Amino acid sequence: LQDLLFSDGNVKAFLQATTTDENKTALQQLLVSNADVLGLLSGNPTSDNKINLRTMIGAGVPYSLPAATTTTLGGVKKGAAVTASTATDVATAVKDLNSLITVLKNAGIISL
Amino acid sequence: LQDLLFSDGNVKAFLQATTTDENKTALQQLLVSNADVLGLLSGNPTSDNKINLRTMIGAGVPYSLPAATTTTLGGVKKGAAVTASTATDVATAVKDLNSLITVLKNAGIISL
Protein backbone atom coordinates (compact mmCIF):
# COMPACT_ATOMS: atom_id res chain seq x y z
CA LEU A 1 0.00 0.00 0.00
CA GLN A 2 2.94 2.31 0.72
CA ASP A 3 4.17 1.58 -2.82
CA LEU A 4 0.75 2.76 -4.14
CA LEU A 5 0.76 5.85 -1.92
CA PHE A 6 4.26 7.32 -2.12
CA SER A 7 6.58 7.93 -5.04
CA ASP A 8 9.85 8.80 -3.30
CA GLY A 9 12.01 5.76 -2.55
CA ASN A 10 13.91 7.38 0.28
CA VAL A 11 10.63 8.35 1.96
CA LYS A 12 9.40 4.80 1.41
CA ALA A 13 12.46 3.37 3.13
CA PHE A 14 11.90 5.66 6.10
CA LEU A 15 8.26 4.55 6.32
CA GLN A 16 9.45 0.88 6.34
CA ALA A 17 11.87 1.82 9.14
CA THR A 18 14.74 0.37 7.12
CA THR A 19 17.17 2.86 5.60
CA THR A 20 20.46 2.43 3.83
CA ASP A 21 23.25 4.92 4.12
CA GLU A 22 22.16 6.34 0.73
CA ASN A 23 18.54 6.63 1.95
CA LYS A 24 19.82 8.40 5.08
CA THR A 25 21.80 10.93 2.99
CA ALA A 26 18.70 11.77 1.02
CA LEU A 27 16.46 11.99 4.07
CA GLN A 28 18.99 14.29 5.81
CA GLN A 29 18.72 16.58 2.79
CA LEU A 30 14.92 16.75 3.22
CA LEU A 31 15.33 17.71 6.87
CA VAL A 32 18.30 20.15 6.94
CA SER A 33 19.37 22.83 4.44
CA ASN A 34 22.77 23.90 5.78
CA ALA A 35 25.50 22.16 3.80
CA ASP A 36 27.98 22.07 6.68
CA VAL A 37 25.40 20.55 9.04
CA LEU A 38 24.65 17.95 6.34
CA GLY A 39 28.39 17.22 6.37
CA LEU A 40 28.21 16.64 10.12
CA LEU A 41 25.15 14.37 9.84
CA SER A 42 27.07 12.16 7.34
CA GLY A 43 29.72 11.45 10.00
CA ASN A 44 32.32 12.33 7.36
CA PRO A 45 32.43 16.13 6.95
CA THR A 46 34.80 17.56 4.34
CA SER A 47 37.69 19.84 5.37
CA ASP A 48 35.52 22.85 4.44
CA ASN A 49 32.59 21.49 6.46
CA LYS A 50 34.84 21.07 9.51
CA ILE A 51 36.06 24.67 9.35
CA ASN A 52 32.50 25.93 8.92
CA LEU A 53 31.13 23.73 11.75
CA ARG A 54 33.70 25.14 14.14
CA THR A 55 32.83 28.67 13.04
CA MET A 56 29.14 27.84 13.46
CA ILE A 57 29.58 26.96 17.18
CA GLY A 58 32.52 29.31 17.87
CA ALA A 59 34.89 26.40 18.61
CA GLY A 60 38.68 26.54 18.24
CA VAL A 61 41.19 23.93 17.03
CA PRO A 62 43.44 21.94 19.45
CA TYR A 63 45.92 24.49 20.73
CA SER A 64 49.59 23.72 20.94
CA LEU A 65 51.73 26.19 22.91
CA PRO A 66 54.67 27.27 20.69
CA ALA A 67 58.14 28.19 21.99
CA ALA A 68 58.82 31.93 22.26
CA THR A 69 60.67 33.49 19.32
CA THR A 70 62.16 36.95 18.85
CA THR A 71 59.02 37.89 16.82
CA THR A 72 56.24 35.74 18.28
CA LEU A 73 54.76 35.33 21.75
CA GLY A 74 55.32 31.82 23.15
CA GLY A 75 56.00 29.63 26.15
CA VAL A 76 59.32 29.22 27.90
CA LYS A 77 60.77 26.61 30.13
CA LYS A 78 61.51 27.70 33.66
CA GLY A 79 65.21 28.40 34.31
CA ALA A 80 67.33 26.27 36.65
CA ALA A 81 68.00 27.54 40.17
CA VAL A 82 70.42 30.44 40.59
CA THR A 83 72.04 31.34 43.88
CA ALA A 84 72.01 34.94 45.11
CA SER A 85 75.47 36.57 44.79
CA THR A 86 77.84 37.09 47.74
CA ALA A 87 80.69 38.35 45.54
CA THR A 88 83.24 40.74 47.06
CA ASP A 89 85.43 41.04 43.93
CA VAL A 90 84.86 41.68 40.19
CA ALA A 91 85.90 38.18 39.10
CA THR A 92 83.24 36.55 41.28
CA ALA A 93 80.52 39.11 40.42
CA VAL A 94 81.20 38.34 36.73
CA LYS A 95 81.09 34.62 37.45
CA ASP A 96 77.62 35.09 39.07
CA LEU A 97 76.30 37.26 36.20
CA ASN A 98 77.45 34.64 33.73
CA SER A 99 75.70 31.89 35.70
CA LEU A 100 72.43 33.81 35.33
CA ILE A 101 73.01 34.32 31.60
CA THR A 102 73.67 30.63 31.00
CA VAL A 103 70.56 29.63 32.98
CA LEU A 104 68.42 31.97 30.88
CA LYS A 105 70.08 30.65 27.69
CA ASN A 106 69.55 27.01 28.79
CA ALA A 107 65.78 27.64 29.28
CA GLY A 108 65.46 29.40 25.92
CA ILE A 109 64.54 32.64 27.67
CA ILE A 110 67.32 34.49 25.78
CA SER A 111 69.03 33.78 22.44
CA LEU A 112 72.45 32.22 21.78
CA LEU B 1 -3.36 9.72 -0.79
CA GLN B 2 -0.66 11.01 1.57
CA ASP B 3 -2.89 14.05 2.18
CA LEU B 4 -5.70 11.64 3.22
CA LEU B 5 -3.37 9.58 5.42
CA PHE B 6 -1.22 12.05 7.35
CA SER B 7 -2.08 15.25 9.18
CA ASP B 8 1.36 16.70 9.90
CA GLY B 9 2.66 18.95 7.13
CA ASN B 10 6.30 18.51 8.00
CA VAL B 11 5.89 14.73 7.93
CA LYS B 12 4.11 15.09 4.59
CA ALA B 13 6.99 17.07 3.13
CA PHE B 14 9.43 14.40 4.26
CA LEU B 15 7.29 11.70 2.63
CA GLN B 16 7.32 13.73 -0.65
CA ALA B 17 11.12 13.94 -0.31
CA THR B 18 10.93 17.72 -0.62
CA THR B 19 11.58 19.71 2.54
CA THR B 20 12.02 23.40 3.16
CA ASP B 21 14.33 24.74 5.80
CA GLU B 22 11.26 25.20 8.06
CA ASN B 23 10.17 21.58 7.43
CA LYS B 24 13.73 20.46 8.26
CA THR B 25 13.68 22.38 11.59
CA ALA B 26 10.46 20.66 12.57
CA LEU B 27 11.63 17.22 11.48
CA GLN B 28 14.90 17.66 13.43
CA GLN B 29 12.76 18.33 16.51
CA LEU B 30 10.93 15.01 15.99
CA LEU B 31 14.23 13.17 15.78
CA VAL B 32 16.46 14.77 18.47
CA SER B 33 15.58 16.13 21.93
CA ASN B 34 18.83 17.84 22.99
CA ALA B 35 18.52 21.57 22.37
CA ASP B 36 22.23 22.10 21.72
CA VAL B 37 22.32 19.25 19.18
CA LEU B 38 19.28 20.82 17.50
CA GLY B 39 21.34 24.02 17.34
CA LEU B 40 24.11 22.11 15.57
CA LEU B 41 21.70 20.48 13.09
CA SER B 42 20.42 23.97 12.10
CA GLY B 43 23.94 24.93 10.96
CA ASN B 44 23.51 28.12 13.00
CA PRO B 45 23.95 27.28 16.70
CA THR B 46 23.52 30.11 19.21
CA SER B 47 26.43 31.21 21.43
CA ASP B 48 24.99 29.06 24.24
CA ASN B 49 24.63 26.07 21.90
CA LYS B 50 28.28 26.41 20.85
CA ILE B 51 29.53 26.40 24.45
CA ASN B 52 27.33 23.40 25.26
CA LEU B 53 28.39 21.49 22.10
CA ARG B 54 32.04 21.89 23.03
CA THR B 55 31.30 20.71 26.56
CA MET B 56 29.34 17.78 25.13
CA ILE B 57 32.38 16.47 23.18
CA GLY B 58 35.07 17.76 25.58
CA ALA B 59 36.50 20.14 22.95
CA GLY B 60 38.43 23.33 23.73
CA VAL B 61 38.46 26.75 22.03
CA PRO B 62 41.31 27.89 19.71
CA TYR B 63 44.24 28.45 22.04
CA SER B 64 46.41 31.52 21.77
CA LEU B 65 49.66 31.46 23.77
CA PRO B 66 49.81 34.65 25.90
CA ALA B 67 53.03 36.48 26.84
CA ALA B 68 54.31 35.77 30.35
CA THR B 69 53.34 38.31 33.01
CA THR B 70 54.47 38.72 36.62
CA THR B 71 51.20 36.98 37.70
CA THR B 72 50.36 34.64 34.83
CA LEU B 73 52.17 31.78 33.13
CA GLY B 74 52.97 32.54 29.47
CA GLY B 75 55.34 32.18 26.55
CA VAL B 76 58.58 34.05 26.09
CA LYS B 77 60.72 34.84 23.13
CA LYS B 78 64.15 33.27 23.12
CA GLY B 79 66.94 35.69 24.10
CA ALA B 80 69.64 36.81 21.66
CA ALA B 81 73.05 35.14 21.82
CA VAL B 82 75.33 36.00 24.74
CA THR B 83 79.04 35.32 24.76
CA ALA B 84 80.65 33.59 27.74
CA SER B 85 82.70 36.03 29.87
CA THR B 86 86.51 36.25 29.75
CA ALA B 87 86.66 39.31 32.03
CA THR B 88 89.79 39.84 34.15
CA ASP B 89 88.63 43.13 35.74
CA VAL B 90 85.46 44.43 37.45
CA ALA B 91 84.55 46.87 34.67
CA THR B 92 84.44 44.09 32.07
CA ALA B 93 82.64 41.60 34.35
CA VAL B 94 79.97 44.28 34.91
CA LYS B 95 79.80 44.93 31.17
CA ASP B 96 79.15 41.17 30.61
CA LEU B 97 76.51 40.95 33.37
CA ASN B 98 74.74 43.94 31.87
CA SER B 99 74.78 42.33 28.42
CA LEU B 100 72.94 39.33 29.86
CA ILE B 101 70.41 41.58 31.62
CA THR B 102 69.65 43.52 28.44
CA VAL B 103 69.22 40.29 26.43
CA LEU B 104 66.74 38.98 28.99
CA LYS B 105 64.94 42.36 29.02
CA ASN B 106 64.83 42.44 25.18
CA ALA B 107 63.15 38.98 25.08
CA GLY B 108 60.62 39.95 27.75
CA ILE B 109 62.06 37.34 30.10
CA ILE B 110 62.52 39.99 32.83
CA SER B 111 60.73 43.31 33.47
CA LEU B 112 61.91 46.85 32.71
UniProtKB/Swiss-Prot annotation, chains A, B:
Full-protein residues shown: 170 to 280 of 280
UniProt subcellular location: Virion
Family of this protein: Belongs to the phi29likevirus major capsid fiber protein family.
Quaternary state and interactors: Homotrimer. Forms a super helix coiled coil in the homotrimer.
Function (record text): Protein that forms the 55 capsid fibers. These fibers are not always present and may have been lost in some lab strains. They may enhance the attachment of the virions onto the host cell wall.
Name of the featured protein: Capsid fiber protein
